[PDB]
Write an enzyme that holds these catalytic residues in place. Structure first.
Site, PDB file in Angstrom:
ATOM      1  N   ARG A  71       0.805  -1.220   0.000  1.00  0.00           N
ATOM      2  CA  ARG A  71       0.000   0.000   0.000  1.00  0.00           C
ATOM      3  C   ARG A  71       0.835   1.264   0.000  1.00  0.00           C
ATOM      4  CB  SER A 131       7.023  -6.227   7.049  1.00  0.00           C
ATOM      5  OG  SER A 131       6.504  -6.428   5.763  1.00  0.00           O
ATOM      6  CG  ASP A 185       5.683  -5.892   9.873  1.00  0.00           C
ATOM      7  OD1 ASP A 185       6.825  -6.070  10.363  1.00  0.00           O
ATOM      8  OD2 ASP A 185       4.953  -6.833   9.482  1.00  0.00           O
TER       9      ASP A 185
HETATM   10  O1  LIG Z   1       0.459 -10.189   6.458  1.00  0.00           O
HETATM   11  P1  LIG Z   1      -0.651  -9.415   7.096  1.00  0.00           P
HETATM   12  O2  LIG Z   1      -1.920 -10.366   7.425  1.00  0.00           O
HETATM   13  O3  LIG Z   1      -1.183  -8.208   6.146  1.00  0.00           O
HETATM   14  O4  LIG Z   1      -0.244  -8.753   8.487  1.00  0.00           O
HETATM   15  C1  LIG Z   1       0.930  -7.948   8.589  1.00  0.00           C
HETATM   16  C2  LIG Z   1       0.666  -6.538   8.050  1.00  0.00           C
HETATM   17  O5  LIG Z   1      -0.583  -5.999   8.597  1.00  0.00           O
HETATM   18  C3  LIG Z   1      -0.844  -4.633   8.094  1.00  0.00           C
HETATM   19  O6  LIG Z   1      -2.112  -4.110   8.556  1.00  0.00           O
HETATM   20  C4  LIG Z   1       0.291  -3.680   8.504  1.00  0.00           C
HETATM   21  O7  LIG Z   1       0.020  -2.342   8.063  1.00  0.00           O
HETATM   22  C5  LIG Z   1       1.607  -4.162   7.913  1.00  0.00           C
HETATM   23  O8  LIG Z   1       2.695  -3.296   8.308  1.00  0.00           O
HETATM   24  C6  LIG Z   1       1.880  -5.627   8.374  1.00  0.00           C
HETATM   25  O9  LIG Z   1       3.094  -6.143   7.738  1.00  0.00           O
HETATM   26  O1  LIG Z   2       5.416  -9.037   8.636  1.00  0.00           O
HETATM   27  C1  LIG Z   2       5.657  -9.803   9.821  1.00  0.00           C
HETATM   28  C2  LIG Z   2       7.181 -10.298   9.892  1.00  0.00           C
HETATM   29  O2  LIG Z   2       7.483 -11.179   8.780  1.00  0.00           O
HETATM   30  C3  LIG Z   2       8.782 -11.843   8.966  1.00  0.00           C
HETATM   31  O3  LIG Z   2       8.961 -12.471  10.287  1.00  0.00           O
HETATM   32  C4  LIG Z   2       9.856 -10.770   8.882  1.00  0.00           C
HETATM   33  O4  LIG Z   2      11.128 -11.385   9.124  1.00  0.00           O
HETATM   34  C5  LIG Z   2       9.633  -9.644   9.914  1.00  0.00           C
HETATM   35  O5  LIG Z   2      10.484  -8.565   9.565  1.00  0.00           O
HETATM   36  C6  LIG Z   2       8.187  -9.130   9.931  1.00  0.00           C
HETATM   37  O6  LIG Z   2       7.991  -8.277  11.058  1.00  0.00           O
END
Ligand SMILES: O=P(O)(O)OC[C@H]1O[C@@H](O)[C@H](O)[C@@H](O)[C@@H]1O
Ligand SMILES: OC[C@H]1O[C@H](O)[C@H](O)[C@@H](O)[C@@H]1O
Length: 441
Positions: A71, A131, A185
């Protein structure tokens, strides 16, 4: 018959002592990592030295990469916070393709977004929520150590992601990058929930992947200089046990999943907890059960050989207590796995078993963190909030509850409140970038 089923699921049912040992061993891994000894937790400094300190104004662009959604975001921080956003697609092709294509695509989206928002010429400070594991020696820099989850983009590892973006901006000939800030993240979420909760000092993610961060005392972070104050640390606990220290826990099914993944041997602890992998843990169990004659009367359901049929959206729906058995079977007949009742019951039991362990492990984790923070500050009681995000956590019927319960069981002297992030990491990223701008001026 049902004897075999229980024998098989036995390892997924962890007793109190076992769970305490997991907490104990994470607690050890944290200690070692910080002192610079060999740990499976990288314990990466994020150079975020304070949760949102009162007022921090500014208009920031924000990237959010590595989750189920990529996003682009505009974040306007004043008295209040105002966010606009748009999701864009990143196919496995792009995610595992070339670094050049990956960031080319990323830039294209920014240009698109900017053009749609009227941002255009104005080159704003970017808050990059990225992330994945990075070695940071400042907010404005982050060298990707490893891809994790579903990414394998080439020529990126060992590169500063801020540079990777510049090179793409110059290639796609976009607007010059201004002050960029790299945030995990976990850190992004922590800071978002920290906006309106001062006791929020831990970021927890349980979605595609799992990870946690928390405010460690600066004196304890041997890698960084200084003693006065504190700093957020990205534990990168997904890779917990990559040293083989969790052989005690790994089931044969965990093994099967790991070996069948993009990154065998890597992110082992993550592969027992997060949305990307749980569905597979189930699938192998079901496969094993069928071969034992327990499930499907032995008959070969080729569909069960298909990878990634049990997704988070599904795992959360299957376990809903508002479902009747006919409806559980409907869902599986709807995924191409028609079942009889008895089978349907065993399948549902398997899901509970797996998701339970997932919640409990994560719980033991959060337990170790809250305890670390409490013991770090020589307290007899701790009130602390956890900024948490992730579709699995957010959607699953029992997960969040079963965690909270485990945190009580294992960290009773701590009063842990869980905050679910309503606005994602972009909000926190922007707040961090605000400091990064102050840090430049
Ligand atoms: O992989 P998922 O289910 O989207 O959860 C993790 C993500 O959730 C989102 O809502 C966050 O803004 C991200 O930063 C995060 O990495
Ligand atoms: O997105 C959730 C997580 O995914 C993986 O563990 C990544 O190594 C880490 O950086 C992140 O916080």
């Amino acid at each position: 018959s049902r004897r075999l089923l229980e024998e098989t699921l036995a390892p997924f049912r962890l007793n109190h002592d076992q769970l305490a040992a997991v907490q104990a061993q994470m607690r050890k891994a944290m200690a070692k990592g910080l002192r610079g000894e060999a740990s499976s937790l990288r314990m990466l400094p994020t150079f975020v030295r304070a949760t949102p300190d009162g007022s921090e104004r500014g208009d920031f662009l924000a990237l959010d990469l590595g989750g189920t959604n990529f996003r682009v975001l505009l974040v306007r921080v004043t008295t209040g916070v105002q966010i606009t956003s748009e999701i864009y697609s990143i196919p496995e092709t792009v995610a595992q393709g070339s670094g050049q294509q990956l960031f080319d695509h990323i830039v294209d989206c920014i240009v698109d977004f900017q053009q749609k928002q009227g941002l255009s010429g104005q080159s704003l400070p970017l808050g990059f929520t990225f992330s994945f594991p990075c070695r940071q020696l400042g907010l404005d820099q982050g060298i990707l150590l490893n891809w994790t989850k579903g990414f394998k983009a080439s020529d990126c590892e060992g590169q500063d992601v801020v540079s990777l973006l510049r090179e793409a901006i110059t290639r796609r000939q976009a607007v010059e990058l201004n002050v960029v800030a790299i945030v995990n993240d976990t850190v992004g979420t922590m800071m978002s929930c920290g906006y309106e909760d001062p006791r929020c000092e831990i970021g927890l993610i349980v979605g595609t992947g799992t990870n946690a961060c928390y405010m460690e005392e600066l004196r304890n972070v041997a890698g960084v200089p200084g003693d006065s104050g504190r700093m957020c640390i990205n534990m990168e606990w997904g890779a917990f046990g990559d040293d083989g220290s969790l052989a005690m826990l790994s089931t044969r099914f965990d093994a099967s999943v790991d070996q069948a993944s993009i990154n065998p041997g890597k992110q082992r602890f993550e592969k027992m907890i997060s949305g990307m992998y749980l569905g597979e843990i189930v699938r192998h169990i079901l496969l094993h059960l069928t071969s034992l004659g327990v499930l499907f009367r032995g008959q070969q359901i080729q569909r069960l050989q298909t990878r990634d049929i049990f997704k988070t959206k599904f795992l959360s729906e299957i376990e809903s207590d508002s479902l009747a058995l006919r409806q559980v079977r409907a869902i599986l007949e709807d995924l191409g796995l028609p079942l009889t009742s008895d089978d349907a019951l065993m399948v549902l039991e398997v899901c509970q078993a797996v998701s339970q362990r997932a919640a409990q492990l994560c719980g033991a984790g959060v337990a170790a963190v809250v305890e670390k923070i409490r013991e770090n500050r020589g307290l007899e009681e701790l009130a602390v909030s956890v900024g948490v995000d992730g579709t699995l956590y957010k959607l699953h019927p029992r997960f969040s509850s079963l965690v909270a319960a485990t945190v009580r069981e294992l960290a009773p002297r701590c009063v842990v409140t869980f905050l679910q992030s309503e606005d994602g990491s972009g909000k926190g990223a922007a707040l961090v970038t605000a400091v990064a701008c102050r840090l430049a001026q």
